[model samples]
Target chain A: VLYVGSKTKEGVVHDVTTVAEKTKEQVTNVGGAVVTGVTAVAQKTVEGAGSIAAATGFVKKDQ
Target chain B: VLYVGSKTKEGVVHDVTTVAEKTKEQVTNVGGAVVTGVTAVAQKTVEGAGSIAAATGFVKKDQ
Candidate 1:
């Protein structure tokens, strides 16, 4: 019975490790998405700031 | 011995469920962060566009 218990625990460890591995991959993918999304948003923000500056006459010419 | 095996399996099930619950909470928190980030980006985009419009004399205002 003790041997069985040890084997069962080993199985649990293996299963949990598998879940962790999958979760890590998912998190990496999500991190990439976040990076891409933030980059796009930053570009848009810059465009908006430039426009506002032009509108307020801070910039002499319109783009 | 069979009864012990069932008890052991039940224990494993309970442990796995606990892990799942914690993961759900973490995902929820991450979701909230994503929503907030996107909303802020949207606001900045609008501000930039309005500025660009004004600079081009489309709005005729320096605000």
Candidate 2:
């Protein structure tokens, strides 16, 4: 599984939502699955973003 | 009423003020009473956060 996230400049969490949207599109284009999780942290909590824009990811699979 | 908002990723805006300060301290630690209002949107802007920080908010009550 792949967890992708994004944060935008404006303090609006939706900004990240937009990134998530784009990311989902890209991931699907590459034949991947994007899953939403409760533990996922929105852009608001991301640190050191500073202003430009950022994206992070993680991969987890049932052992 | 409860309104939660956040933004981040190298765009300043205090990184969504640490997720609304931990969502207002867990919305007052579960007592509920988290009477917040007015959606908020903040960010450094497309020009790129520009190396600064700020915050925003609002509220309302019925008579």
Candidate 3:
């Protein structure tokens, strides 16, 4: 019973960890998308602006 | 001067990541999900208190 209980908890923990990581990746993706759009728009509309397609300033990496 | 509401989304992005991490802390868990396991363990002990269940044993014992 103890072993079964421990394994069940471990599996649930792993599943939860996977969800957390997936969410972090999705947020980083949101940052990447904005960076892409800003770069493209700034180039044509704001003559002096440099492209910043790789900017990840929008994502937090807090653990 | 600030027809530039575009930057507002930037604030949103930053704030949400904090919420995201905080939620991860609040939520990251097998501990929470163990309610199901706890219910199961409880049922086992209560039934075992007298004696009873498989999936079949469970139906008979809990019932």
Candidate 4:
């Protein structure tokens, strides 16, 4: 669940576009599809992604 | 509370530094301690996290 709240902020928030806590926007692209002879699987939703924002996840201590 | 495990790395693990589910090693520093306060406040240790791996929190296909 994509949530947004800050130690200094009020309540939680969410958005559909976020894919991580960093809340970076998702990008869509139309890359080439793959197909085969006997059993072909052609994809449509051409999308790409980056690695997780950080390898080490930590919670920001709230005071 | 901290834990270490992998879909490909066998069983679950726990350690003193884990504050999240990423299995990322906890980097110790002078800026520590407050987890007791967190437990006192939140009343529970948050479970695993991996970006959700996806912000939408959908269980990965894992197939």
Candidate 5:
């Protein structure tokens, strides 16, 4: 999943892009294909992700 | 939350850092507190986060 946004007082307001393999099996170039093979995957661009009270996952706190 | 690691063929080999509020109420400087108020929170530094077959969360595909 690729999240682009910011953290706020309520929570985080951002966009979520979910990435998956065209094939069911976990193979090579999964994450590596993000930049290249992204179009082939189940990519969803959700604008205005709203405020998440608890976003538990891979994230970097950058102010 | 702060995640430091990389993407692999099997899945993603990385580290996960969970972030939360120091106070009960949802106030200002939550995500922004990462660099500054990190000490007051439940911060755990887990080395060698190991490999995760299915890493589902905020991530960026950068090879």
Candidate 6:
């Protein structure tokens, strides 16, 4: 399992939930799942600016 | 088989002779393969620099 965390421009640290939904869509396209309570960080920083860091985590079911 | 080694404060250890050919090219570009039977290692020195271990490996084609 992977835990993703990032800070917003407001210096606010948001859990994976906000971005998890969109991330899950992409992951599902690639055959992945967004486990319960598992918020994935999909992208990290737009244009590589600000403190916003987007990220994601995944666990192989069989692994 | 990804085996790359870095040494010297100037010179570099370079090669492209390993595994198959085309798989060898990308195993060459988007990827790198410098198999000279070299091994990768890690170090804890400088504050973070000592044994200076470095290493690389590849996944199976089917894997």
Q: What is the DockQ of each candidate?
A: 0.08, 0.05, 0.01, 0.03, 0.04, 0.02
- Mark the regions of model 4 whose C-alpha exceeds 4 Å error after superposition: A1-48, A53-63, B1-11, B17-63
Q: State the lDDT at A19 in candidate 6.
A: 18
* CAPRI rating of model 3: incorrect
Q: Model 2: what is its DockQ?
A: 0.05
| A18-51: candidate 2 lDDT, tens digit per residue | 1122222211212222222112122333234453
lDDT string, candidate 3, A13-57, tens digits: 111111122232211221121221111001111112332221222
How does model 3 score by TM-score? Answer: 0.13
- lDDT tens digits by residue: candidate 4, B1-63: 223331121121222121222322222223222111111011112224332221111112232
In TM-score terms, candidate 1 sits at 0.13
Q: List TM-score (chain A only) for every prediction.
A: 0.10, 0.15, 0.14, 0.15, 0.19, 0.19
- As for candidate 3, its clashing pairs are B53-B57, B53-B58, B54-B57, B54-B58
lDDT of 3 by residue, B3-26 (tens): 222321110111111112222211
Worst 10 residues of 5 chain B by lDDT: B34-43
Tell me, by lDDT, which candidate is best. Answer: 2
- Residue-level lDDT for A35 in candidate 1: 21
Q: Which stretches of candidate 5 lie over 4 Å from their true place?
A: A1-9, A26-63, B1-63
Q: For residue A44, what is the lDDT in candidate 6?
A: 19
lDDT for each residue of candidate 6 in A3-62, tens digit (9 for 90 to 100):
234221321223222111122221122333232232222221133222212212222232
lDDT against the true structure, each candidate: 0.23, 0.27, 0.18, 0.21, 0.25, 0.23
For each of the candidates, the C-alpha root-mean-square deviation to the true structure, in angstroms, is 23.4, 20.6, 29.1, 23.8, 22.6, 20.5
Task: Estimate TM-scores for all models.
Answer: 0.13, 0.15, 0.13, 0.13, 0.14, 0.15
Who wins the DockQ comparison?
1
Candidate 2, position B54, lDDT: 28
**Candidate 4 structure quality by residue, lDDT tens digits, A1-63:** 223332222221222121113323232222211111111111112133432321112333224
Report the lDDT tens digits of candidate 1 across residue range A1-63. Answer: 333333232212112111211232122222111221111111123354334431211223224
